[PDB]
Design an enzyme around this catalytic site. Structure first.
Site, PDB file in Angstrom:
ATOM      1  N   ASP A  57      -2.651  21.577  -4.292  1.00  0.00           N
ATOM      2  CA  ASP A  57      -1.902  21.615  -3.018  1.00  0.00           C
ATOM      3  C   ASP A  57      -2.368  22.868  -2.257  1.00  0.00           C
ATOM      4  O   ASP A  57      -2.558  23.911  -2.889  1.00  0.00           O
ATOM      5  CB  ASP A  57      -0.382  21.650  -3.218  1.00  0.00           C
ATOM      6  CG  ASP A  57       0.349  21.565  -1.882  1.00  0.00           C
ATOM      7  OD1 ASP A  57       0.405  20.469  -1.311  1.00  0.00           O
ATOM      8  OD2 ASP A  57       0.789  22.603  -1.378  1.00  0.00           O
ATOM      9  N   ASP A 138      12.121  13.336 -22.725  1.00  0.00           N
ATOM     10  CA  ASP A 138      11.972  12.702 -24.058  1.00  0.00           C
ATOM     11  C   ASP A 138      10.687  11.883 -24.069  1.00  0.00           C
ATOM     12  O   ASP A 138      10.071  11.837 -25.083  1.00  0.00           O
ATOM     13  CB  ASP A 138      13.176  11.841 -24.476  1.00  0.00           C
ATOM     14  CG  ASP A 138      13.759  10.875 -23.443  1.00  0.00           C
ATOM     15  OD1 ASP A 138      13.234  10.787 -22.297  1.00  0.00           O
ATOM     16  OD2 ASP A 138      14.768  10.190 -23.817  1.00  0.00           O
ATOM     17  N   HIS A 142       7.775  12.735 -26.576  1.00  0.00           N
ATOM     18  CA  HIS A 142       7.412  11.610 -27.460  1.00  0.00           C
ATOM     19  C   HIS A 142       5.882  11.482 -27.495  1.00  0.00           C
ATOM     20  O   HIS A 142       5.313  11.355 -28.574  1.00  0.00           O
ATOM     21  CB  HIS A 142       8.137  10.366 -26.966  1.00  0.00           C
ATOM     22  CG  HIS A 142       7.721   9.111 -27.636  1.00  0.00           C
ATOM     23  ND1 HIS A 142       8.557   8.436 -28.527  1.00  0.00           N
ATOM     24  CD2 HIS A 142       6.568   8.427 -27.579  1.00  0.00           C
ATOM     25  CE1 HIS A 142       7.920   7.377 -28.960  1.00  0.00           C
ATOM     26  NE2 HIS A 142       6.698   7.338 -28.390  1.00  0.00           N
ATOM     27  N   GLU A 143       5.245  11.458 -26.340  1.00  0.00           N
ATOM     28  CA  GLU A 143       3.782  11.188 -26.272  1.00  0.00           C
ATOM     29  C   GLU A 143       3.007  12.382 -26.845  1.00  0.00           C
ATOM     30  O   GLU A 143       2.099  12.168 -27.680  1.00  0.00           O
ATOM     31  CB  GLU A 143       3.347  10.868 -24.851  1.00  0.00           C
ATOM     32  CG  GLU A 143       3.991   9.654 -24.249  1.00  0.00           C
ATOM     33  CD  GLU A 143       3.772   8.361 -24.993  1.00  0.00           C
ATOM     34  OE1 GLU A 143       2.936   8.323 -25.899  1.00  0.00           O
ATOM     35  OE2 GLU A 143       4.408   7.376 -24.589  1.00  0.00           O
ATOM     36  N   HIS A 146       2.827  12.380 -30.454  1.00  0.00           N
ATOM     37  CA  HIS A 146       1.787  11.528 -31.091  1.00  0.00           C
ATOM     38  C   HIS A 146       0.551  12.402 -31.386  1.00  0.00           C
ATOM     39  O   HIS A 146      -0.020  12.241 -32.446  1.00  0.00           O
ATOM     40  CB  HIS A 146       1.394  10.318 -30.246  1.00  0.00           C
ATOM     41  CG  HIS A 146       2.408   9.215 -30.286  1.00  0.00           C
ATOM     42  ND1 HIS A 146       2.802   8.597 -31.467  1.00  0.00           N
ATOM     43  CD2 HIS A 146       3.107   8.610 -29.310  1.00  0.00           C
ATOM     44  CE1 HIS A 146       3.681   7.665 -31.200  1.00  0.00           C
ATOM     45  NE2 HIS A 146       3.916   7.666 -29.903  1.00  0.00           N
ATOM     46  N   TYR A 157      -1.209   3.796 -37.073  1.00  0.00           N
ATOM     47  CA  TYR A 157      -0.318   3.144 -36.085  1.00  0.00           C
ATOM     48  C   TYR A 157      -0.201   1.653 -36.407  1.00  0.00           C
ATOM     49  O   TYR A 157      -0.484   0.804 -35.572  1.00  0.00           O
ATOM     50  CB  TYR A 157      -0.818   3.406 -34.673  1.00  0.00           C
ATOM     51  CG  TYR A 157       0.264   3.337 -33.626  1.00  0.00           C
ATOM     52  CD1 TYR A 157       1.231   4.328 -33.534  1.00  0.00           C
ATOM     53  CD2 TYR A 157       0.316   2.292 -32.717  1.00  0.00           C
ATOM     54  CE1 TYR A 157       2.225   4.281 -32.565  1.00  0.00           C
ATOM     55  CE2 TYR A 157       1.290   2.235 -31.737  1.00  0.00           C
ATOM     56  CZ  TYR A 157       2.253   3.228 -31.666  1.00  0.00           C
ATOM     57  OH  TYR A 157       3.205   3.199 -30.689  1.00  0.00           O
ATOM     58  N   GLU A 166       6.079   6.295 -34.792  1.00  0.00           N
ATOM     59  CA  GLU A 166       6.956   6.108 -33.612  1.00  0.00           C
ATOM     60  C   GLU A 166       8.247   6.923 -33.792  1.00  0.00           C
ATOM     61  O   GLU A 166       8.652   7.629 -32.865  1.00  0.00           O
ATOM     62  CB  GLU A 166       7.276   4.629 -33.394  1.00  0.00           C
ATOM     63  CG  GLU A 166       6.297   3.956 -32.484  1.00  0.00           C
ATOM     64  CD  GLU A 166       6.228   4.576 -31.102  1.00  0.00           C
ATOM     65  OE1 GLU A 166       7.300   4.718 -30.453  1.00  0.00           O
ATOM     66  OE2 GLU A 166       5.108   4.913 -30.680  1.00  0.00           O
ATOM     67  N   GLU A 187      19.296   8.723 -27.003  1.00  0.00           N
ATOM     68  CA  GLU A 187      18.693   7.502 -26.429  1.00  0.00           C
ATOM     69  C   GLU A 187      17.264   7.881 -26.010  1.00  0.00           C
ATOM     70  O   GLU A 187      17.024   9.083 -25.780  1.00  0.00           O
ATOM     71  CB  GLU A 187      19.441   7.006 -25.194  1.00  0.00           C
ATOM     72  CG  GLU A 187      20.935   6.810 -25.391  1.00  0.00           C
ATOM     73  CD  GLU A 187      21.308   5.528 -26.106  1.00  0.00           C
ATOM     74  OE1 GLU A 187      21.381   4.439 -25.426  1.00  0.00           O
ATOM     75  OE2 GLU A 187      21.530   5.618 -27.329  1.00  0.00           O
ATOM     76  N   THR A 194      14.748   1.255 -16.105  1.00  0.00           N
ATOM     77  CA  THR A 194      15.608   0.399 -15.241  1.00  0.00           C
ATOM     78  C   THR A 194      16.439   1.294 -14.324  1.00  0.00           C
ATOM     79  O   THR A 194      17.648   1.414 -14.519  1.00  0.00           O
ATOM     80  CB  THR A 194      16.439  -0.571 -16.100  1.00  0.00           C
ATOM     81  OG1 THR A 194      17.174   0.179 -17.067  1.00  0.00           O
ATOM     82  CG2 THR A 194      15.566  -1.582 -16.815  1.00  0.00           C
ATOM     83  N   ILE A 197      20.147   0.198 -13.117  1.00  0.00           N
ATOM     84  CA  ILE A 197      21.128  -0.260 -14.153  1.00  0.00           C
ATOM     85  C   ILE A 197      21.588   0.967 -14.967  1.00  0.00           C
ATOM     86  O   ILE A 197      20.744   1.641 -15.574  1.00  0.00           O
ATOM     87  CB  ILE A 197      20.538  -1.386 -15.031  1.00  0.00           C
ATOM     88  CG1 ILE A 197      20.086  -2.594 -14.196  1.00  0.00           C
ATOM     89  CG2 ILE A 197      21.521  -1.789 -16.128  1.00  0.00           C
ATOM     90  CD1 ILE A 197      19.129  -3.529 -14.907  1.00  0.00           C
ATOM     91  N   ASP A 200      21.626   2.369 -19.749  1.00  0.00           N
ATOM     92  CA  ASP A 200      20.763   1.633 -20.709  1.00  0.00           C
ATOM     93  C   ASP A 200      19.471   2.446 -20.883  1.00  0.00           C
ATOM     94  O   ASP A 200      19.180   3.332 -20.049  1.00  0.00           O
ATOM     95  CB  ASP A 200      20.526   0.172 -20.300  1.00  0.00           C
ATOM     96  CG  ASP A 200      19.506  -0.002 -19.190  1.00  0.00           C
ATOM     97  OD1 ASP A 200      19.565   0.777 -18.224  1.00  0.00           O
ATOM     98  OD2 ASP A 200      18.636  -0.897 -19.313  1.00  0.00           O
ATOM     99  N   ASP A 226       3.441  -6.091 -32.046  1.00  0.00           N
ATOM    100  CA  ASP A 226       3.736  -4.640 -31.885  1.00  0.00           C
ATOM    101  C   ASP A 226       3.104  -3.886 -33.069  1.00  0.00           C
ATOM    102  O   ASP A 226       3.773  -3.045 -33.683  1.00  0.00           O
ATOM    103  CB  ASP A 226       5.254  -4.457 -31.800  1.00  0.00           C
ATOM    104  CG  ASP A 226       5.694  -3.043 -31.486  1.00  0.00           C
ATOM    105  OD1 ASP A 226       5.017  -2.374 -30.670  1.00  0.00           O
ATOM    106  OD2 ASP A 226       6.683  -2.612 -32.098  1.00  0.00           O
ATOM    107  N   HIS A 231       7.422  -0.171 -32.915  1.00  0.00           N
ATOM    108  CA  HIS A 231       8.490   0.212 -31.947  1.00  0.00           C
ATOM    109  C   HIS A 231       9.828  -0.418 -32.369  1.00  0.00           C
ATOM    110  O   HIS A 231      10.843  -0.130 -31.715  1.00  0.00           O
ATOM    111  CB  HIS A 231       8.156  -0.235 -30.522  1.00  0.00           C
ATOM    112  CG  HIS A 231       7.031   0.523 -29.909  1.00  0.00           C
ATOM    113  ND1 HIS A 231       5.738   0.020 -29.852  1.00  0.00           N
ATOM    114  CD2 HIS A 231       7.001   1.748 -29.341  1.00  0.00           C
ATOM    115  CE1 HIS A 231       4.963   0.917 -29.276  1.00  0.00           C
ATOM    116  NE2 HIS A 231       5.723   1.975 -28.942  1.00  0.00           N
TER     117      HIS A 231
HETATM  118 CA   LIG Z   1      18.430   2.421 -16.168  1.00  0.00          CA
HETATM  119 CA   LIG Z   2      17.096  10.820 -24.142  1.00  0.00          CA
END
Ligand SMILES: [Ca+2]
Ligand SMILES: [Ca+2]
Ligand SMILES: c1cnc2c(c1)ccc1cccnc12
Ligand SMILES: c1cnc2c(c1)ccc1cccnc12
Ligand SMILES: c1cnc2c(c1)ccc1cccnc12
Ligand SMILES: c1cnc2c(c1)ccc1cccnc12
Ligand SMILES: c1cnc2c(c1)ccc1cccnc12
Ligand SMILES: c1cnc2c(c1)ccc1cccnc12
Length: 316
Positions: A57, A138, A142-143, A146, A157, A166, A187, A194, A197, A200, A226, A231
């Site tokens: 930038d 998260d 997470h990645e 790995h 894997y 995982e 979670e 989503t 929503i 979730d 999978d 997963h």
């Molecule tokens: Ca959502």
């Molecule tokens: Ca979380």
């Protein structure tokens, strides 16, 4: 690039303002020189050629909507680096301050994020199933976890070793979320999954079955999808780690919690000292019990709770 360390500001995917470590040389680059061999964030420009161009930038200000995923990939890579260093005395993913490289705007409407063997890669999501996946601390942790796994246990894997792979990413993703401490939960992906929503997520560690994942070895997926359910069967191990940390009764087996820090110390030790590329769930049970013994003694509560938690998910 060679230049001077600066501090920019911008806004992340969820519209939150944060400071970012940049490097000035004609432009201001998303290059953080404060952490190991640096954290570098790149623009893939909606294409799949990697890494793309180092993010720049002209004014050290990162408030364009196009900037948002770059700000969060850069900032949450720094949080993750801080977690491994401050908590586990681990210097970046390889233990030797490897540069952390992330690409954002990968492809068009791509509902995924991954470690490609060399770097992190983030889709922007299709806007319905996902928003830019770097928005989730998260997801970022997470990645990168790995990468930590690949450089340590090297868990293959596929099948049970892949499900442990995982589950380690979900566990350490969740412990980095708690380390940052911004409304953390058990979670996975709630901040970017989503958008329209409420409450979730991709996966639950407290109640894997909430999203159809097994919470007992007897219920494990044995088919080929999978990569043999990496997963899916992760739920069995995620539930065990949740129970070790937070406690509870599960299929009538009661577990006394020992807290997140001891969960992290035990699984970090197991991952770096005992797990191998072919470790199955029962071998994870053995690795964790030994890690707990190493750290707390063979008659410790800590060892008792590990055994209770693996019994509760039917892993002997
Ligand atoms: Ca959502
Ligand atoms: Ca979380
Ligand atoms: C060039 C410029 N600044 C830096 C480095 C290299 C390396 C490490 C570092 C640590 C803290 C702050 N700035 C730097
Ligand atoms: C606070 C808020 N908005 C701004 C600044 C500081 C500085 C520069 C600028 C340039 C264009 C648009 N907004 C701002
Ligand atoms: C705090 C500081 N700088 C900014 C904002 C908020 C918001 C928008 C913006 C746009 C251009 C330049 N700076 C800013
Ligand atoms: C590599 C690169 N891009 C993709 C995939 C794999 C898989 C699915 C997909 C869907 C939308 C956009 N890009 C991709
Ligand atoms: C993407 C992935 N890995 C890299 C780069 C870009 C750039 C430089 C580099 C140097 C050493 C190791 N990996 C990388
Ligand atoms: C199939 C068979 N046995 C079981 C299950 C499924 C699920 C939970 C459970 C708990 C205790 C003992 N057996 C089972």
């Amino acid at each position: 690039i060679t230049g001077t360390s600066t501090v920019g500001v911008g806004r992340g995917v969820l519209g939150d303002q944060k400071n970012i470590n940049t490097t000035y040389s004609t432009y201001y680059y998303l290059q953080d020189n404060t952490r190991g061999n640096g954290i570098f964030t790149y623009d893939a420009k909606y294409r799949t050629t990697l890494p793309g161009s180092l993010w720049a930038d002209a004014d050290n200000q990162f408030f364009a909507s196009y900037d948002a995923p770059a700000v969060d990939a850069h900032y949450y890579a720094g949080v993750t680096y801080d977690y491994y260093k401050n908590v586990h005395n681990r210097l970046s993913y390889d233990g030797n301050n490897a540069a952390i490289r992330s690409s954002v705007h990968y492809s068009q409407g791509y509902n995924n994020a991954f470690w490609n063997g060399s770097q992190m890669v983030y889709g922007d999501g299709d806007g319905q199933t996902f928003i830019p996946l770097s928005g989730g601390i998260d997801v970022v942790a997470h990645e990168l976890t790995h990468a930590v796994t690949d450089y340590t246990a090297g868990l293959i894997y596929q099948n049970e070793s892949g499900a442990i792979n995982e589950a380690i990413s979900d566990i350490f993703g969740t412990l980095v979320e708690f380390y940052a401490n911004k409304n953390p939960d058990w979670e996975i992906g709630e901040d970017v999954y989503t958008p329209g929503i409420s409450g979730d997520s991709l996966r639950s560690m407290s109640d894997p079955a909430k999203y159809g994942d097994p919470d007992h070895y007897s219920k494990r997926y044995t088919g080929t999808q999978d990569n043999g359910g990496v997963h899916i069967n992760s739920g069995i191990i995620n539930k065990a780690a949740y129970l070790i940390s937070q406690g509870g009764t599960h299929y009538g087996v009661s577990v006394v919690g020992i807290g997140r820090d001891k969960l992290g110390k035990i699984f970090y030790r197991a991952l770096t000292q005992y797990l191998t590329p072919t470790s199955n769930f029962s071998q994870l049970r053995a690795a964790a019990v030994q890690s707990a013994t190493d750290l707390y003694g063979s008659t410790s509560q800590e060892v008792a709770s590990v055994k209770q938690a693996f019994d509760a998910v039917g892993v002997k």
